[PDB]
Each structure stands twice: as structure tokens, then as C-alpha cells.
Amino acid sequence: QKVEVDIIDDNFILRWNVTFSFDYQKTGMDNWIKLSGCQNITSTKCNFSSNVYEEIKLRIRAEKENTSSWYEVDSFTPFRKAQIGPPEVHLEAEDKAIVIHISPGSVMWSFTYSLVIWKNSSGVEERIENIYSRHKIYKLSPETTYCLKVKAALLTSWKIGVYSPVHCIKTTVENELPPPENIEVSVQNQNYVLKWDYTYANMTFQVQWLHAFLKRNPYKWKQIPDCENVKTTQCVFPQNVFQKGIYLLRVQASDGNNTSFWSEEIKFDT
């Protein structure tokens, strides 16, 4: 019989009427030191928050009513062994898009995220890489249940993380007003010209902008005043309303009563 130990975030996890007690020592040491709060537990997990680049060994004392055995584990460095735990995920849905809110699931530990998504009916998985912690997936079908799981990563330290539990959400009934489409910027004179397509006539629109870098690991979208409630599928505004830089633009439609969901966010490099 022998034991190994895995680490997820701040927990030692044992892999093989019994209780467990954990000791450790720094490698090249005589005696064993008890890990506080990890003595006579039923759980195979020991939370050790309270120096992860130092080499250590563990000793696990497996006890019963009248007998016990003490197993040592090979030397390890906790950081090198650690696995990143499953992130916490919350989903929200529109008719044709899903928004994924992600946050870490702390002593051991910036994270890069990835996900896997599939339609419940089909099970065909699409993998999306390098997503951020409020990612939006477009081009989905209304009243359709999608399922997904998310993992964290630390590409610098070559760690690939554990997937969150699966979460599913059903997209809502189709919005009668679809989002504006095909958004494009061009320049005329000292102005920018924002153009888009729309499926219905006699609509009004609004355009909002955001500094693009603000999207990472999160800010208020702001109106472009000239574009506010425009009655056609374009607006013209002075170049000098934006400093040089990288922005995001989005457009929403209205019939005076209801609004579409937002168009996709488009990159705007001045």
C-alpha cells in the first residue's frame, strides 16, 4: 500500500473506519511536524494555508480503532505540484448570445481562461481560448439550451487547470428587433462615418464606446452624442472626439417602444 498527494489550490488531496493525520518536514530534516487542523480527520483533504517554492515531504498517518500505518510521500514543491482549481461561473442569456462571468474558484497563486461549449442536443463541442472573465458568445439560436465548462490556466508556469462544473442555460425567445449588423467605420473630411445595416425601416439607434483595454479582467460605456437617437443607419462625428487609441463601439436599435439587444462589440482603431 502506498499514497501519493495531489494539490488543488490550497489543498493537499490524498490518493491511495479510518481517520487521517498529516505531518510535514522540509527536505533534509530529522523530524516531522504536525499540520494544524489536519489531525484525525475523515476527509482526505487538508487545507494548508497557514511557503510554496520550498521542497517538503508529507507523512500521512492512517488510523483506525486499534491500528495505524504511517506513509511518507516523495519530496515535492507545492507550487510545482499544484493544479489550478475550477473557476466560479455564472451565465446570462439573450436570444442569440450568452455572457459568461468567471472568477477564481488564496496562497498558492495571472490567469488565462478557456471554455468548452456545446448545444445540449448535439454534444458537438467548440473550444474557445483565451477568454476573459465576462466573455460574450454570439450567433446562437433562440430557445436553445447550451452547456459549457470553463478552466483557468497559467501558461507561463505551464499549468492547465481543472474544469468548472457544467453550467447550462437556455437562450430566450427571439427579440423581434434584431441587433444592428455589419458595423463599419470610415473617414470623410475631418469626420468619422459610422455605418451599419438594419433589417427594419423607421428605427432609431444609439452608439456607445468604451476604451478597449478596460475589457480585461474587470467601466461605463458612453454615448457618442452625435449618434444619439439617429434616425438612419449611420452617424457622422468629428475625428477629434477620440484621442488616438483603440476603442470598442456598439449599436442598439429601437422602434420607440422596445430595443434590440446590442450589436456585437467592434474594434475601432483611430
Does the protein bind ligand NAG through residue 165 (CB under 6 A)? no
Does the protein bind ligand NAG through residue 123 (CB under 6 A)? yes
**Comparison of 81 and 167: residue with beta carbon closer to ligand NAG:** 167
| Residue showing the smallest CB distance to ligand NAG in the complex | 123
Residues near ligand NAG (CB under 6 A), total: 4
Does the protein bind ligand NAG through residue 91 (CB under 6 A)? no
Which one among 99, 147, 154, 162 touches ligand NAG, defined by CB under 6 A? 147
Which amino acid does the sequence have at 230? Answer: V
Look up residue 136 and give its three cell numbers. 460574450
Mark the segment that binds ligand NAG (CB under 6 A) among 28-36, 47-55, 117-125, 213-221.
117-125
Least Å from the CB of residue 147 to ligand NAG: 5
Contact indicator for 22, 58 with CB cutoff of 8 Å: yes
d(CA 43, CA 60): 12
Closest among 69, 64, 75, 83 to 4, alpha carbons compared = 75
Q: How far is CA 23 from the centre of its chain?
A: 35
Least Å from the CB of residue 124 to ligand NAG: 9
**With 0-12 CB in 10 A as exposed, 13-18 as middle and 19+ as buried, what is 264?**
middle
Least Å from the CB of residue 97 to ligand NAG: 19
Give the torsion sign (CA, 14, 16, 21, 25).
negative
Q: Which residues bind ligand NAG (CB under 6 A)?
A: 118, 120, 123, 147
